[PDB]
């Protein structure tokens, strides 16, 4: 492929109203330029941090984006990914499992 492969997960087992961290991991892509945005209800989350560019042993690039959040039972959390291999941004929905 060479497009991003994207996984969205929380640092801890998620629970409504308990402070946590939402992670968006994108991997397997090339070139390394890439846009990853964490979002609540389609609003970008504040305070997001981005890992130093690194790559897998197959040379494919990867990046972790994370941000503090307190999951809300009535919110949709998503990760939006733009990459030159994609014609339109792809969004990936967090599955809260709670």
């Amino acid at each position: 492929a060479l497009t991003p492969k994207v996984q969205v997960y929380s640092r801890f087992p998620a629970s409504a109203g308990t402070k946590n961290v939402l992670n968006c991991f994108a991997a397997g892509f090339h070139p390394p330029k890439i846009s990853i945005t964490l979002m609540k209800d389609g609003v970008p989350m504040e305070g997001a941090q981005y890992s130093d560019m690194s790559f897998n042993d197959d040379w494919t690039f990867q990046r972790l984006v994370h941000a503090d959040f307190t999951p809300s039972s009535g919110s949709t959390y998503a990760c939006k990914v733009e990459h030159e291999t994609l014609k339109e941004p792809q969004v990936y929905k967090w599955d809260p499992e709670f």
Binding site: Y9, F12, P13, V21, N23, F25, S35, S54, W59
Partner: protein
């Protein structure tokens, strides 16, 4: 008792808004210990892993890094034209390091990639190069004929690297020996006729973990799919497996997780 030090170096002509052109990430046993990038132009430890580093060590590291950034700049400038593909963005990568195996023998790794594709590699134990293709061969023959790189990198891989690994394992021993159990959550959701059971392991160290699914005491590899092992921001890891089940059989399925932090594998239901 096997331990590893790895440097992952990227040079980029198009890193993206607010992003460095040249990045070095250093890992010991799957923990980031230090970083360099062209914006900071400094090499710096992860203070969580390396709480009491001397400035002397990281001055040396910072200067070797800056030298590495120059060399990548020189590659990114010559290689595209040599490969008759000067159009586009371009990347340069290097992976190198060493292993100290449980018996004390050493292994060196030294590999390069241009535009995400194998370019060149060097084997410390024979001090010979290999090229990925006829254009890389030009680089290989120039370097081995000049004689200097092989001495350099034999020394770098088999001495300097080995010394720094030994140092980082000692300095970071508080962080390296602390075993961190996975926190496991099993969860199903029923759509149409099927129920998706997902088993997620949260925040474990060290990085190797196994996850598998069970009906009775029989595994069910055929219907399982694994998300793979992915990082957290704090030097732990995340892993997951999923399986689809008839919704009237979900209490019969158990998630099994093996990890160095668990004397016995752990069994988790929905």
């Amino acid at each position: 008792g096997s331990h590893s030090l790895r440097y992952f170096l990227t040079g980029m002509t198009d890193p993206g808004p607010g992003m460095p052109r040249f990045v070095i990430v250093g890992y010991v046993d799957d923990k980031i210990f230090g970083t360099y990038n062209s914006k900071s132009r400094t090499a710096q430890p992860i203070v969580e892993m390396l709480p009491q580093e001397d400035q002397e060590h990281w001055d040396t590291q910072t200067q070797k890094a800056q030298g590495g950034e120059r060399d990548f700049d020189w590659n990114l400038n010559r290689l595209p034209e040599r490969y008759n593909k000067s159009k586009g963005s371009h990347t340069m990568q290097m992976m190198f390091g060493c292993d100290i195996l449980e018996d004390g023998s050493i292994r060196g790794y030294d590999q390069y990639a241009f535009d995400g594709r194998d370019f060149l590699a060097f084997d410390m134990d024979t001090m010979t190069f290999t090229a990925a293709d006829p254009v890389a061969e030009i680089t290989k023959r120039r370097w081995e004929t000049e004689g200097t790189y092989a001495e350099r990198w034999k020394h770098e891989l088999g001495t300097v690297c080995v010394q720094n690994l030994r140092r980082y394992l000692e300095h970071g021993k508080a962080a390296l020996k602390r075993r961190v159990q996975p926190e496991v959550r099993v969860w199903g959701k029923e759509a149409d006729g099927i129920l998706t059971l997902s088993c997620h392991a949260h925040g474990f160290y060290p990085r190797p973990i196994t996850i598998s699914w069970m009906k009775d005491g029989m595994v069910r590899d055929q219907e399982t799919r694994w998300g793979g092992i992915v990082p957290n921001s704090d030097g732990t890891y995340h892993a997951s497996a999923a399986i689809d089940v008839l919704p009237e059989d979900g209490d019969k399925y158990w998630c099994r997780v093996e990890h160095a932090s668990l004397p016995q594998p752990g069994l988790f239901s929905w």
